[PDB]
């Protein structure tokens with residue numbers, strides 16, 4: 001009887017940060033209560049000042065990472081305020097039935113709904129909006145995120161030994177398809193209905209105009225760079241709701257990688273680059289061994305360095321000259 | 333001596349259905365005899381009525397799924413009737429030597445040939461036409477299918493326990509590259525020779541105009557939706573002869589997935605989405621747990637919902653409110 | 665103390681050949697000394713005579729395959745002669761720290777540098793040039809290669825038994841993005857600075873104009889076809905620094921495949937086609953069973969047969985009619 005289970009309310013945080021949770025379950029199964037509010041808003045996505053009408057869960061692209069344990073129940077209250085103009089819903093790849101919840105969560109502006117589902121499979125999973133007849137538009141406008149369902153005894157390596165992370169970050173990679181005129185400049189629109197056929201035409205090229213981490217070119221750089229220290233074990237969760245991506249930590253590795261994100265499978269070891277299929281979330285564990293700046297990129301380098309799919313880690317600590325050294329510094 | 337083996341003639345069926353076979357081999361190795369007749373025909377591939385000149389094995393896109401056991405011999409009689417205009421052949425990725433049989437099966441219109449090969453590796457494998465100098469044209473005009481070579485003791489899970497399916501479906505995903513004029517309308521042609529350079533130019537964009545299951549937008553929907561019942565174990569074989577695809581069952585999972593299709597490898601567990609590389613067939617096993625409509629899609633959602641790469645399952649049975657429930661239905 | 669280790673100087677060879685090495689380490693850890701000289705040069709990449717300004721390590725696209733054992737130290741002397749015009753550096757995906765060495769190896773023309781790093785993870789790894797603000801231009805102009813770090817006890821199969829290769833080849837697959845005018849003809853340029861914005865614009869299409877093995881259409885064909893004999897165990901290392909590829913040996917298989925190239929993981933068995941993500945190197949082991957010509961291709965067949973991503977193996981020996989035979993040769 002689900003009514004006899006403990007309930008716990010989670011307060012979500014903005015990516016790339018992740019709400020507090022326990023890796024190993026410290027309670028029995030619980031109903032884990034989340035609330036998200038849909039926000040349609042203008043977002044500046046690049047250095048040129050290109051501004052799109054984003055569709056978001058909780059004001060961010062991506063939506064927040066939700067974290068539960070296997071065989072918990074996830075209960076989501078989804079709010080569509082009357083300040084929005086569109087119908088939205090939510091589909092969880094973690095859930096079973098009703099198009100992942102999409103069939104049960106259609107909310108017009110001024111409506112709310114509450115969905116409960118049992119998290120029966122451990123892994124990281126995409127969630128996204130999926131309104132009938134409009135699915136790729138919503139998803140490619142930013143309306144996606146991920147949920148992590150941890151095994152009750154936490155993560156394990158290929159030999160079944162515990163893998164415990166010290167820090168976790170969530171990188172949502174978003175492909176935008178900003179409509180272009182024939183000269184190649186981005187077009188702007190006065191209503192969603194007036195933008196829609198042009199959105200569809202831009203999507204049908206299959207060529208994103210921008211591919212960004214955390215919602216904008218340069219979002220995970222500067223004062224918003226990811227951080228770690230030498231010796232820290234970091235889990236990076238990475239999702240892409242629509243298009244394949246190939247994450248790579250420049251100067252590092254994926255020590256243990258679940259490229260398709262499902263923790264019942266043994267991880268791949270020592271990866272340089274891993275492929276996360278469109279519509280999947282993956283997770284990579286790394287222990288930093290050197291200080292300095294790392295670039296975390298989609299290793300289609302055009303996507304990384306021309307279209308925006310790159311962020312930085314700033315790592316503190318001691319340099320290890322055994323692992324790498326300049327023997328002769330650049331000279332004539 | 334192959335002449336001392338039993339011979340069994342198979343009568344093929346139209347995808348997404350699969351000819352009758354045994355999962356566990358009930359005989360010793362056999363020569364399994366198949367016949368396919370090449371048919372060049374006009375096919376309407378979308379709701380707008382876009383009509384292409386398809387090149388098919390046995391009148392269908394994809395070609396039929398052939399099913400044998402490891403170390404059977406496959407004997408194929410390939411017929412190119414004099415009503416066709418082109419040279420064709422057949423390459424099996426399951427076979428060893430002679431470009432998969434392609435070098436030995438070149439048939440002009442009015443010719444036939446018979447190829448025999450030993451199915452030495454268990455898995456699902458693409459087959460396709462591959463005439464010298466014209467390969468991608470034939471393949472992207474529909475001339476591809478798959479063959480499943482089952483282990484003699486049937487499929488096994490990651491622990492080596494039997495996995496037995498109740499139903500099997502074959503989804504062939506086809507990328508078409510319909511030539512477009514500068515305004516973006518599809519062009520039409522009076523002969524294959526007159527279409528060819530325009531075909532090549534359209535292929536060189538690397539951007540399909542259509543991506544469809546079972547040969548047309550909406551082919552696996554409505555009265556042609558895939559079916560199952562709650563509790564049924566279903567194997568979905570999915571092939572793509574030219575381009576990567578990322579299947580996803582909306583509302584379900586791949587309980588056991590061989591994303592690159594080869595059964596000597598342990599399956600990946602609990603997949604949301606899996607990547608099948610171009611030129612590969614993969615196979616996903618799922619036990620349905622909820623009734624209703626599921627969408628089976630390529631999870632590039634643009635490819636799914638704008639370009640045609642989506643089908644439906646209709647699943648009968650009892651709803652499980654423990655797994656998913658609406659707690660508060662959408663309301664003001 | 666690294667000064668007490670043996671030093672061994674390697675003389676590199678042109679791809680697809682690989683310098684001589686031992687599969688099983690016959691010495692303790694060593695400092696393995698390599699020298700590469702950067703060469704900017706004009707290269708004819710297709711049958712039409714399209715000529716690009718290539719940027720190379722050691723005069724070749726790809727750069728040479730370096731081969732060391734796990735926990736060796738790699739010491740590279742990188743030379744940028746004053747005959748070149750650009751700044752270059754080198755990033756090794758095998759290395760840990762300083763952006764894979766990129767931060768420590770920036771060499772102006774007329775400069776050289778020496779980097780040492782410990783090869784701590786066994787696998788095949790990409791290396792490439794990565795100058796700040798210009799990364800995809802250098803990489804997509806040919807400035808990439810791979811390094812193989814073998815386990816000290818050589819390669820092993822999925823059961824931990826030795827896999828020993830008789831021959832090894834390195835296939836570098838390169839995506840070029842040759843700028844096109846509006847009519848679609850390739851443009852030509854009088855300086856790198858004058859080409860750069862057009863390079864960027866061509867890259868931003870995400871649609872390569874050429875995809876080639878060993879630096880040009882047809883490079884691994886004819887007198888430069890790869891060779892083997894029936895019964896020979898061949899390892900093919902394949903890298904792609906920027907874009908996903910899906911290798912396939914037409915008429916063969918990948919008996920044992922490390923699609924993401926890392927030897928601590930068990931190989932995938934019996935692959936028809938495998939996906940190597942952009943920014944990764946993979947390795948496939950095959951024992952030839954039939955003589956004749958094989959085509960080794962990217963199984964996006966458009967990329968293979970229209971854009972250049974295809975090479976040949978010529979295999980000597982005895983035909984096995986048990987594995988494949990023409991029963992009835994093509995006839996009326």
Ligand SMILES: O=N[O-]
Pocket residue numbers: 242243244278576632635
């Ligand atoms: O085929 N693009 O996901």
Ligand SMILES: O=N[O-]
Pocket residue numbers: 574575576610908964967
């Ligand atoms: O690179 N397309 O398969």
Ligand SMILES: O=N[O-]
Pocket residue numbers: 244300303906907908942
């Ligand atoms: O998304 N191309 O690597």
Ligand SMILES: [Cu+2]
Pocket residue numbers: 055087088089129130131138143
């Ligand atoms: Cu929405």
Ligand SMILES: [Cu+2]
Pocket residue numbers: 091093126128279580582631
């Ligand atoms: Cu989805």
Ligand SMILES: [Cu+2]
Pocket residue numbers: 387419420421461462463470475
């Ligand atoms: Cu054909």
Ligand SMILES: [Cu+2]
Pocket residue numbers: 423425458460611912914963
């Ligand atoms: Cu093929």
Ligand SMILES: [Cu+2]
Pocket residue numbers: 719751752753793794795802807
């Ligand atoms: Cu360079």
Ligand SMILES: [Cu+2]
Pocket residue numbers: 248250299755757790792943
């Ligand atoms: Cu790199």
